[PDB]
Amino acid sequence: NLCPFGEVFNATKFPSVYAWERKKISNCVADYSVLYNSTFFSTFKCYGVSATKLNDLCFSNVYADSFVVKGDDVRQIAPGQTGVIADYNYKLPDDFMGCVLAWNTRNIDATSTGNYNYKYRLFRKSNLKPFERDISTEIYQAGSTPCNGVEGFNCYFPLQSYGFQPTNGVGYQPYRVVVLSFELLNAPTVCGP
Amino acid sequence: STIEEQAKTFLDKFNHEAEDLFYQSSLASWNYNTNITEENVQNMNNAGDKWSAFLKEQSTLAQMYPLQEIQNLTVKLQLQALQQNGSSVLSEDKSKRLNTILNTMSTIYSTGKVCNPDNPQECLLLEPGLNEIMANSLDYNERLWAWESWRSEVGKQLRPLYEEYVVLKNEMARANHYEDYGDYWRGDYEVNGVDGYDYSRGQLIEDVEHTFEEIKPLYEHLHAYVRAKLMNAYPSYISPIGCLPAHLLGDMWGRFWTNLYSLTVPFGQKPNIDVTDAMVDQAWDAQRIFKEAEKFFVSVGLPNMTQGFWENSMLTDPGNVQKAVCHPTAWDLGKGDFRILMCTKVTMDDFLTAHHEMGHIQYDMAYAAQPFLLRNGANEGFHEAVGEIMSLSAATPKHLKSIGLLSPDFQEDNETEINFLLKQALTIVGTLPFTYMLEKWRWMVFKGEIPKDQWMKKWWEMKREIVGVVEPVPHDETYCDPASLFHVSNDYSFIRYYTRTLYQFQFQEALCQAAKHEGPLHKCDISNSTEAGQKLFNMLRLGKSEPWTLALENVVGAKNMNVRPLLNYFEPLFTWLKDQNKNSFVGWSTDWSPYA
Numbered sequence: 057n058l059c060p061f062g063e064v065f066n067a068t069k070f071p072s073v074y075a076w077e078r079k080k081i082s083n084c085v086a087d088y089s090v091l092y093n094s095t096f097f098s099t100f101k102c103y104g105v106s107a108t109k110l111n112d113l114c115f116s117n118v119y120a121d122s123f124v125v126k127g128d129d130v131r132q133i134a135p136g137q138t139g140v141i142a143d144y145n146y147k148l149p150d151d152f153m154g155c156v157l158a159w160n161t162r163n164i165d166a167t168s169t170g171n172y173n174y175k176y177r178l179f180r181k182s183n184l185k186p187f188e189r190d191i192s193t194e195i196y197q198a199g200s201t202p203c204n205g206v207e208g209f210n211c212y213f214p215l216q217s218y219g220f221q222p223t224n225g226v227g228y229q230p231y232r233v234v235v236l237s238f239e240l241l242n243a244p245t246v247c248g249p
Numbered sequence: 250s251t252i253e254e255q256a257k258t259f260l261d262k263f264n265h266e267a268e269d270l271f272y273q274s275s276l277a278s279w280n281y282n283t284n285i286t287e288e289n290v291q292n293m294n295n296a297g298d299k300w301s302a303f304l305k306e307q308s309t310l311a312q313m314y315p316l317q318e319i320q321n322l323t324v325k326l327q328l329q330a331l332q333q334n335g336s337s338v339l340s341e342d343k344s345k346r347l348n349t350i351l352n353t354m355s356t357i358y359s360t361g362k363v364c365n366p367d368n369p370q371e372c373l374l375l376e377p378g379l380n381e382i383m384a385n386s387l388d389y390n391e392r393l394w395a396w397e398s399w400r401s402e403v404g405k406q407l408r409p410l411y412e413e414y415v416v417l418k419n420e421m422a423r424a425n426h427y428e429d430y431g432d433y434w435r436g437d438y439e440v441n442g443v444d445g446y447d448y449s450r451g452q453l454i455e456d457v458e459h460t461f462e463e464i465k466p467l468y469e470h471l472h473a474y475v476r477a478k479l480m481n482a483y484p485s486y487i488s489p490i491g492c493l494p495a496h497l498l499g500d501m502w503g504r505f506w507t508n509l510y511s512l513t514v515p516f517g518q519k520p521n522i523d524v525t526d527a528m529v530d531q532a533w534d535a536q537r538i539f540k541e542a543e544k545f546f547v548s549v550g551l552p553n554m555t556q557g558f559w560e561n562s563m564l565t566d567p568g569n570v571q572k573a574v575c576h577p578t579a580w581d582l583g584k585g586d587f588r589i590l591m592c593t594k595v596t597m598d599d600f601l602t603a604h605h606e607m608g609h610i611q612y613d614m615a616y617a618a619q620p621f622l623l624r625n626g627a628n629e630g631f632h633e634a635v636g637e638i639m640s641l642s643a644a645t646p647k648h649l650k651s652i653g654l655l656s657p658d659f660q661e662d663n664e665t666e667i668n669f670l671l672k673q674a675l676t677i678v679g680t681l682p683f684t685y686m687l688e689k690w691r692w693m694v695f696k697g698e699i700p701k702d703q704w705m706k707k708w709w710e711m712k713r714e715i716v717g718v719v720e721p722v723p724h725d726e727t728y729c730d731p732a733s734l735f736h737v738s739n740d741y742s743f744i745r746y747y748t749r750t751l752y753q754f755q756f757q758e759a760l761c762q763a764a765k766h767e768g769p770l771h772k773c774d775i776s777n778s779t780e781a782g783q784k785l786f787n788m789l790r791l792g793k794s795e796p797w798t799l800a801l802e803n804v805v806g807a808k809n810m811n812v813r814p815l816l817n818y819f820e821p822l823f824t825w826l827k828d829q830n831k832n833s834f835v836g837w838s839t840d841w842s843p844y845a
């Protein structure tokens with residue numbers, strides 16, 4: 057009973073970073089060669105453990121987070137970054153043990169008219185704790201005047217959409233991102249020869 | 250929350266909202282400029298109006314943050330840039346009328362035709378007919394006809410429009426807390442807040458005049474030499490002590506004396522370094538030209554052009570089915586989109602201008618990480634200065650030989666050097682009195698120092714006295730000869746060319762010292778110099794975040810513009826002219842005219 061990593065990787069629709077989606081992976085064999093014998097990915101960076109010697113390791117379970125970010129913001133999907141994405145959308149712990157993978161998806165996530173579905177959070181009081189997730193669409197109050205749900209002066213809608221078009225530079229083109237985290241308990245499940 | 254923090258969050262929201270709107274406007278205007286149709290012009294105007302409405306909304310919004318309470322210089326700069334009321338301080342009818350007269354002047358300039366009296370079926374507009382005449386004709390009467398027809402036709406139409414233009418622009422500038430429109434234009438160079446790097450709007454006038462004084466002798470000697478050489482070309486038409494007739498200078502105005510080289514070449518016995526025939530015989534195309542420019546820029550430590558650039562740029566004339574605008578332009582659309590629009594021909598001039606425009610593009614790529622309102626040159630001269638140092642390095646015979654377009658056995662005499670320097674001077678130093686005099690006249694008109702009933706009187710007095718150029722026929726106040734130039738009739742400042750000309754030689758000296766160059770500066774090719782590349786990138790990446798004085802100091806070591814780089818570049822030609830003019834008059838009387 058093999059783990060369907062294809063369900064999150066070859067998925068048709070990907071979520072916005074502000075609403076990044078987490079999929080749990082419990083007891084199953086997990087072939088990682090299906091990932092590492094491939095030049096499809098643009099980054100493919102691992103932390104806390106060898107990137108290829110994962111096959112002979114067993115984990116209690118594996119979490120697959122997925123989202124889509126602008127090319128220049130992929131740099132922020134790493135422990136200890138401090139950009140807008142890292143601070144308000146998806147933060148990784150300093151003791152993160154996993155791998156971030158990203159691949160350019162201009163052909164499918166950019167249209168000539170402009171794809172404004174993928175969004176990100178621009179304003180928030182306090183940063184996110186590691187692996188936290190915020191879907192609130194409440195009007196961000198900047199000044200001292202209360203906003204009362206209406207957008208206006210010093211009252212900004214907290215979400216902003218990426219404008220993905222095929223003529224955008226590589227830094228502004230959409231990349232799909234999967235973060236594979238590995239959990240460790242004193243419990244038994246995910247080996248995968 | 251603090252006022253500074255509120256302004257910071259407002260600026261974050263503005264940058265992220267404005268990137269997309271500016272990108273849409275750029276896409277629409279690009280679709281127009283590469284494919285002139287009615288659908289495209291309407292889409293361009295729609296996107297531009299959307300962008301302007303967003304900008305005015307953001308201006309009225311940013312005016313609600315009290316500038317005085319900001320302690321952060323960068324956010325202060327961005328806030329001021331957004332708070333500029335601009336044209337909005339005009340009433341509705343006056344703003345409509347101002348836009349109307351601007352478009353009307355642009356239209357009559359770009360569309361005016363003059364017809365031959367001898368053959369009334371032949372009529373020419375400025376480009377390409379009248380310019381072809383002013384560039385290649387050796388006939389005094391034909392050149393005089395072209396010059397006078399252009400002025401008495403388009404400038405006479407432009408005169409009243411330009412008077413109304415002056416009064417409306419002065420209303421705007423005064424309402425925006427400026428002295429006049431000239432003060433507004435000089436505001437581009439202002440730095441206010443940084444101790445040791447400040448710069449007022451009158452300091453520009455002081456510096457420009459102080460440096461033109463030092464430029465005066467070299468220009469005087471070049472003028473004397475060209476005057477004698479033209480006397481050989483138009484016998485009995487030119488006094489050996491008078492100003493040069495305005496219609497014999499090589500183009501419609503005398504802005505560049507480039508087309509006098511055939512009549513002024515020091516050593517016509519030497520072959521000219523025109524590599525056009527070599528390019529044609531090696532089957533070069535625009536692809537190859539821009540690839541070679543890209544290799545040049547990579548050779549100094551700068552990045553390639555983007556695949557988006559190579560996929561989206563238009564580097565050749567699309568033909569008869571698809572008509573486009575062919576003025577060479579370097580487009581920074583935003584969102585990492587960089588393009589070049591150029592109807593490239595296989596010529597040495599287009600090779601050098603491709604280097605220039607790709608230098609523009611490299612500047613834009615280098616300051617892309619800056620916030621939106623800071624993605625711009627340090628001042629109005631920096632982009633052209635960078636492009637020009639690129640083109641100088643590409644124009645050097647060492648580079649031309651290394652690229653293989655010039656024969657390896659081309660002997661560099663002490664006469665080929667004077668030929669090259671004289672041809673360089675006809676363009677670079679020939680244009681400086683022209684630029685300074687035009688902007689001085691414009692400044693004085695905006696300041697209200699030249700009454701309307703002597704606009705042309707003072708214009709030609711200044712022409713004679715400063716530039717050493719005299720009109721071939723007298724002009725009353727019906728004419729508006731300054732507006733017969735594109736920049737004047739299209740509301741573009743002009744001192745940028747003077748300032749960029751000085752900046753470019755400052756930069757050339759600095760980067761060639763970085764490249765450990767040893768010979769005369771004009772023989773310097775900064776190719777293969779990662780040190781010079783790094784020294785230039787350290788300035789390019791700043792954009793408009795730091796003051797232009799600090800940006801200039803970062804590369805050249807000086808807080809202000811300097812003329813000794815230019816004078817040292819032209820020193821050998823200077824001594825050669827001083828020798829060549831030993832038995833010639835240097836200077837000019839302002840009173841002699843080709844008419845009596």
Ligand SMILES: *[C@@H]1O[C@H](CO)[C@@H](O[C@@H]2O[C@H](CO)[C@@H](O[C@@H]3O[C@H](CO)[C@@H](O)[C@H](O)[C@@H]3O)[C@H](O)[C@H]2NC(C)=O)[C@H](O)[C@H]1NC(C)=O
Nearest residue numbers: 059060061062063064065066067087089090091093094096
């Ligand atoms: C998403 O779908 C693609 C294809 O639609 C999957 O890639 C495919 O992976 C298989 C197995 O990894 C490749 O088959 C062959 O496997 C044998 C095993 O011995 C190997 O020797 C061959 O060299 C080859 O790899 C198949 O070629 C490959 N296809 C493509 C187009 O890459 C991908 O695995 C799917 N994603 C996930 C997460 O499963």
Ligand SMILES: *[C@@H]1O[C@H](CO)[C@@H](O[C@@H]2O[C@H](CO)[C@@H](O[C@@H]3O[C@H](CO)[C@@H](O)[C@H](O)[C@@H]3O)[C@H](O)[C@H]2NC(C)=O)[C@H](O)[C@H]1NC(C)=O
Nearest residue numbers: 136137138139253257260320321322323324325618619620
């Ligand atoms: C005026 O306000 C601006 C804020 O817009 C200040 O610039 C900002 O300074 C912070 C902290 O120095 C920068 O954050 C840094 O981000 C990098 C990204 O890799 C990170 O590695 C650092 O650890 C740090 O977190 C921020 O980028 C920067 N913003 C810009 C646009 O440059 C500026 O310092 C203020 N001026 C004065 C004089 O204080």
Ligand SMILES: *[C@@H]1O[C@H](CO)[C@@H](O[C@@H]2O[C@H](CO)[C@@H](O[C@@H]3O[C@H](CO)[C@@H](O)[C@H](O)[C@@H]3O)[C@H](O)[C@H]2NC(C)=O)[C@H](O)[C@H]1NC(C)=O
Nearest residue numbers: 544545548549647648649650651652653657775776777778
């Ligand atoms: C400095 O930049 C110049 C500008 O391109 C470089 O010069 C040229 O480099 C190419 C390849 O590196 C040389 O091509 C070779 O030419 C020889 C001689 O004809 C030919 O037999 C070979 O088959 C090959 O095509 C070219 O000669 C050379 N030109 C000169 C004048 O040197 C140069 O490589 C750069 N120097 C650096 C980076 O150190």
Ligand SMILES: *[C@@H]1O[C@H](CO)[C@@H](O[C@@H]2O[C@H](CO)[C@@H](O)[C@H](O)[C@H]2NC(C)=O)[C@H](O)[C@H]1NC(C)=O
Nearest residue numbers: 280283284285286287288289290567570571572
């Ligand atoms: C030049 O512009 C036109 C429209 O201004 C582009 O589109 C053409 O016209 C309509 C517009 O939707 C289409 O139905 C046509 O099929 C388009 N082509 C032609 C030949 O008319 C046109 O594509 C643009 N040219 C290029 C090369 O992109």
Ligand SMILES: *[C@@H]1O[C@H](CO)[C@@H](O[C@@H]2O[C@H](CO)[C@@H](O)[C@H](O)[C@H]2NC(C)=O)[C@H](O)[C@H]1NC(C)=O
Nearest residue numbers: 540543544546547548550551552553554556559
């Ligand atoms: C700039 O682009 C060129 C090519 O466009 C790069 O040259 C590479 O050169 C060799 C063979 O010519 C190979 O490594 C590659 O095939 C070439 N690249 C490509 C994309 O084909 C050059 O390395 C690039 N330099 C920089 C700094 O980006």
Ligand SMILES: *[C@@H]1O[C@H](CO)[C@@H](O)[C@H](O)[C@H]1NC(C)=O
Nearest residue numbers: 312332333334338424425426
């Ligand atoms: C801009 O114009 C408004 C009037 O509509 C005025 O109140 C405001 O002070 C002006 N801004 C500046 C900087 O003068």
Ligand SMILES: [Cl-]
Nearest residue numbers: 502730731733
């Ligand atoms: Cl004139």
Ligand SMILES: [Zn+2]
Nearest residue numbers: 577578579609
């Ligand atoms: Zn230009």
